Coordinates of all heavy atoms in Angstrom, one line a residue:
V149 N 3.8 -7.7 -21.6 CA 2.9 -7.4 -20.6 C 3.6 -7.3 -19.2 O 3.3 -6.5 -18.3 CB 1.7 -8.4 -20.6 CG1 1.0 -8.4 -19.2 CG2 0.7 -8.0 -21.7
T150 N 4.5 -8.2 -19.0 CA 5.3 -8.2 -17.7 C 6.1 -6.9 -17.5 O 6.1 -6.4 -16.4 CB 6.2 -9.4 -17.7 OG1 5.4 -10.6 -17.7 CG2 7.0 -9.4 -16.4
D151 N 6.7 -6.5 -18.6 CA 7.5 -5.2 -18.5 C 6.5 -4.1 -18.2 O 6.8 -3.2 -17.4 CB 8.3 -5.0 -19.8 CG 9.5 -5.9 -19.9 OD1 10.0 -6.3 -18.9 OD2 9.9 -6.2 -21.0
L152 N 5.4 -4.0 -18.9 CA 4.4 -3.0 -18.6 C 4.0 -3.0 -17.1 O 3.9 -1.9 -16.5 CB 3.2 -3.1 -19.5 CG 2.1 -2.0 -19.6 CD1 1.5 -2.0 -20.9 CD2 1.1 -2.2 -18.5
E153 N 3.7 -4.2 -16.6 CA 3.2 -4.3 -15.2 C 4.3 -3.8 -14.2 O 4.0 -3.2 -13.3 CB 2.8 -5.7 -14.9 CG 2.4 -6.0 -13.5 CD 1.1 -5.3 -13.1 OE1 0.4 -4.8 -13.9 OE2 0.8 -5.3 -11.8
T154 N 5.5 -4.2 -14.5 CA 6.6 -3.8 -13.6 C 6.8 -2.3 -13.6 O 6.9 -1.7 -12.5 CB 7.9 -4.5 -14.0 OG1 7.8 -5.9 -13.8 CG2 9.1 -3.9 -13.2
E155 N 6.7 -1.7 -14.8 CA 6.8 -0.2 -14.8 C 5.6 0.4 -14.1 O 5.8 1.4 -13.4 CB 6.9 0.2 -16.3 CG 7.1 1.7 -16.4 CD 8.0 2.1 -17.6 OE1 7.8 1.6 -18.7 OE2 9.0 2.9 -17.3
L156 N 4.4 -0.1 -14.3 CA 3.3 0.4 -13.6 C 3.4 0.4 -12.1 O 3.1 1.3 -11.4 CB 2.0 -0.3 -14.0 CG 0.7 0.1 -13.3 CD1 0.5 1.6 -13.4 CD2 -0.5 -0.6 -13.9
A157 N 3.9 -0.8 -11.6 CA 4.1 -0.9 -10.1 C 5.1 0.1 -9.6 O 4.9 0.7 -8.5 CB 4.5 -2.4 -9.8
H158 N 6.2 0.2 -10.3 CA 7.2 1.2 -10.0 C 6.6 2.6 -9.9 O 6.9 3.4 -8.9 CB 8.4 1.2 -10.9 CG 9.5 0.3 -10.5 ND1 10.6 0.7 -9.8 CD2 9.7 -1.0 -10.7 CE1 11.4 -0.3 -9.6 NE2 10.9 -1.3 -10.1
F159 N 5.9 3.0 -10.9 CA 5.3 4.3 -11.0 C 4.3 4.5 -9.8 O 4.3 5.6 -9.1 CB 4.5 4.5 -12.3 CG 3.8 5.8 -12.4 CD1 4.5 6.9 -12.9 CD2 2.5 6.0 -12.1 CE1 3.9 8.2 -13.0 CE2 1.9 7.2 -12.2 CZ 2.6 8.3 -12.7
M160 N 3.5 3.5 -9.5 CA 2.5 3.6 -8.4 C 3.2 3.8 -7.1 O 2.9 4.7 -6.2 CB 1.6 2.5 -8.4 CG 0.7 2.4 -9.5 SD -0.4 0.9 -9.5 CE -1.5 1.3 -8.1
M161 N 4.3 3.0 -6.8 CA 4.9 3.1 -5.5 C 5.8 4.4 -5.4 O 6.0 4.9 -4.3 CB 5.8 1.9 -5.2 CG 7.0 1.7 -6.1 SD 7.9 0.3 -5.7 CE 9.3 0.3 -6.9
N162 N 6.2 4.9 -6.5 CA 6.9 6.2 -6.5 C 5.9 7.4 -6.3 O 6.3 8.4 -5.7 CB 7.7 6.4 -7.8 CG 9.1 5.9 -7.7 OD1 9.8 6.1 -6.7 ND2 9.5 5.2 -8.7
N163 N 4.7 7.3 -6.8 CA 3.8 8.4 -6.7 C 2.8 8.3 -5.6 O 2.1 9.3 -5.3 CB 3.0 8.4 -8.0 CG 3.6 9.3 -9.1 OD1 3.3 10.5 -9.2 ND2 4.5 8.7 -9.9
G164 N 2.8 7.2 -4.8 CA 1.9 7.2 -3.6 C 2.4 8.1 -2.6 O 3.5 8.5 -2.5
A165 N 1.4 8.6 -1.7 CA 1.7 9.6 -0.7 C 1.4 9.1 0.7 O 2.1 9.4 1.7 CB 1.0 10.9 -1.0
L166 N 0.3 8.4 0.8 CA -0.2 7.9 2.1 C 0.8 6.8 2.7 O 1.5 6.2 1.9 CB -1.6 7.4 2.1 CG -2.7 8.4 2.3 CD1 -2.7 9.4 1.2 CD2 -4.1 7.7 2.3
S167 N 0.7 6.6 4.0 CA 1.6 5.7 4.7 C 0.9 5.2 5.9 O 0.4 5.9 6.7 CB 2.9 6.3 5.0 OG 3.7 5.5 5.8
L168 N 1.1 3.9 6.2 CA 0.5 3.2 7.4 C 1.5 2.2 7.8 O 2.0 1.4 7.0 CB -0.8 2.6 7.1 CG -2.0 3.5 6.8 CD1 -3.0 2.9 5.8 CD2 -2.7 4.0 8.1
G169 N 1.7 2.1 9.1 CA 2.6 1.1 9.7 C 4.1 1.4 9.5 O 4.5 2.5 9.0
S170 N 4.9 0.5 9.8 CA 6.4 0.6 9.7 C 6.9 -0.6 9.0 O 6.5 -1.8 9.2 CB 7.0 0.7 11.1 OG 8.5 0.8 10.9
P171 N 8.0 -0.5 8.1 CA 8.5 -1.6 7.4 C 9.2 -2.6 8.3 O 9.4 -3.8 7.8 CB 9.5 -0.9 6.5 CG 9.2 0.5 6.4 CD 8.6 0.8 7.7
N172 N 9.5 -2.3 9.5 CA 10.2 -3.2 10.4 C 9.4 -4.5 10.8 O 9.9 -5.5 11.2 CB 10.7 -2.5 11.7 CG 11.8 -1.5 11.4 OD1 12.1 -0.7 12.2 ND2 12.3 -1.5 10.2
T173 N 8.1 -4.4 10.6 CA 7.2 -5.5 11.0 C 6.3 -6.0 9.9 O 5.7 -5.1 9.2 CB 6.3 -5.0 12.2 OG1 7.1 -4.5 13.3 CG2 5.4 -6.2 12.7
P174 N 6.3 -7.3 9.6 CA 5.4 -7.8 8.5 C 4.0 -7.8 8.9 O 3.6 -7.6 10.1 CB 6.0 -9.2 8.3 CG 7.3 -9.2 9.0 CD 7.1 -8.3 10.2
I175 N 3.1 -8.1 7.9 CA 1.7 -8.2 8.2 C 1.4 -9.5 8.8 O 1.7 -10.6 8.4 CB 0.9 -8.0 6.9 CG1 1.1 -6.6 6.3 CG2 -0.6 -8.3 7.1 CD1 0.6 -6.4 4.9
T176 N 0.7 -9.4 10.0 CA 0.4 -10.6 10.7 C -1.1 -10.7 11.1 O -1.6 -11.9 11.2 CB 1.3 -10.7 12.0 OG1 2.6 -10.7 11.6 CG2 1.0 -11.9 12.8
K177 N -1.7 -9.6 11.4 CA -3.1 -9.6 12.0 C -4.1 -9.1 11.1 O -3.9 -8.8 9.9 CB -3.0 -8.8 13.3 CG -1.7 -9.0 14.1 CD -1.7 -8.1 15.4 CE -1.7 -6.6 15.0 NZ -1.8 -5.7 16.2
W178 N -5.4 -9.0 11.6 CA -6.5 -8.5 10.8 C -6.6 -7.0 10.8 O -6.9 -6.4 9.8 CB -7.8 -9.1 11.4 CG -9.0 -8.6 10.8 CD1 -9.7 -9.2 9.7 CD2 -9.8 -7.5 11.2 NE1 -10.8 -8.5 9.4 CE2 -10.9 -7.4 10.3 CE3 -9.7 -6.5 12.2 CZ2 -11.9 -6.4 10.4 CZ3 -10.6 -5.5 12.3 CH2 -11.7 -5.5 11.4
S179 N -6.3 -6.4 12.0 CA -6.2 -4.9 12.0 C -5.2 -4.3 11.1 O -5.4 -3.2 10.5 CB -6.0 -4.4 13.4 OG -4.6 -4.4 13.7
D180 N -4.1 -5.1 10.8 CA -3.1 -4.6 9.9 C -3.6 -4.3 8.5 O -3.1 -3.5 7.8 CB -2.0 -5.6 9.8 CG -0.9 -5.3 10.8 OD1 -0.9 -4.2 11.5 OD2 0.1 -6.1 11.0
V181 N -4.7 -5.0 8.1 CA -5.3 -4.8 6.8 C -6.5 -3.9 6.9 O -6.8 -3.0 6.1 CB -5.7 -6.1 6.2 CG1 -6.2 -5.9 4.8 CG2 -4.5 -7.1 6.1
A182 N -7.3 -4.0 8.0 CA -8.5 -3.2 8.2 C -8.1 -1.7 8.4 O -9.0 -0.9 8.1 CB -9.3 -3.7 9.4
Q183 N -6.9 -1.4 8.8 CA -6.5 0.0 9.0 C -6.5 0.7 7.7 O -6.9 1.9 7.7 CB -5.2 0.0 9.7 CG -4.0 -0.5 8.8 CD -2.7 -0.5 9.6 OE1 -2.5 0.2 10.6 NE2 -1.7 -1.3 9.1
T184 N -6.2 0.1 6.6 CA -6.2 0.8 5.3 C -7.6 1.2 4.9 O -7.8 2.4 4.5 CB -5.6 -0.1 4.2 OG1 -6.5 -1.1 3.9 CG2 -4.3 -0.7 4.7
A185 N -8.6 0.3 5.1 CA -10.0 0.7 4.8 C -10.5 1.8 5.7 O -11.1 2.7 5.3 CB -10.9 -0.6 4.9
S186 N -10.2 1.7 7.0 CA -10.6 2.7 7.9 C -10.0 4.1 7.6 O -10.7 5.1 7.7 CB -10.3 2.3 9.4 OG -10.7 1.0 9.6
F187 N -8.7 4.1 7.3 CA -8.0 5.3 7.0 C -8.6 6.0 5.7 O -8.8 7.2 5.6 CB -6.5 5.1 6.8 CG -5.7 6.4 6.7 CD1 -6.1 7.5 7.4 CD2 -4.6 6.4 6.0 CE1 -5.4 8.7 7.2 CE2 -3.8 7.5 5.8 CZ -4.2 8.7 6.5
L188 N -8.8 5.1 4.7 CA -9.4 5.7 3.4 C -10.8 6.2 3.6 O -11.2 7.2 3.1 CB -9.4 4.6 2.3 CG -8.0 4.5 1.6 CD1 -8.1 3.5 0.5 CD2 -7.7 5.9 1.0
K189 N -11.6 5.5 4.5 CA -12.9 6.0 4.8 C -12.9 7.3 5.5 O -13.6 8.3 5.3 CB -13.8 5.0 5.5 CG -15.2 5.5 5.9 CD -16.0 5.6 4.6 CE -17.5 6.0 5.0 NZ -17.6 7.3 5.6
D190 N -12.0 7.4 6.5 CA -11.9 8.6 7.4 C -11.4 9.8 6.6 O -11.8 10.9 6.8 CB -11.1 8.3 8.6 CG -11.3 9.4 9.7 OD1 -12.1 10.3 9.5 OD2 -10.7 9.2 10.8
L191 N -10.5 9.6 5.6 CA -9.9 10.6 4.9 C -11.0 11.3 4.0 O -11.0 12.6 3.9 CB -8.8 10.1 4.0 CG -7.9 11.2 3.3 CD1 -7.2 12.0 4.3 CD2 -6.9 10.5 2.3

């Protein structure tokens, strides 16, 4: 099951297309998470 899950995560991150934020900064605030919901609703 662990191998299956690892392969699934790899596939998902390879096939995703949307992007928010920059890797240089970690998640710290509330807007950092709320932005995903807002972007998905607006799309």
Side-chain angles (χ1 to χ4, degrees):
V149 159
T150 296
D151 288 331
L152 188 152
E153 174 69 11
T154 293
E155 185 143 50
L156 174 55
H158 266 269
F159 179 86
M160 293 177 71
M161 66 182 180
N162 269 314
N163 270 268
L166 272 64
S167 170
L168 294 146
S170 178
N172 292 170
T173 305
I175 294 169
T176 300
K177 320 178 296 176
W178 176 91
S179 85
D180 267 353
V181 184
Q183 65 185 342
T184 73
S186 309
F187 188 34
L188 275 183
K189 180 67 174 66
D190 197 358
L191 190 62

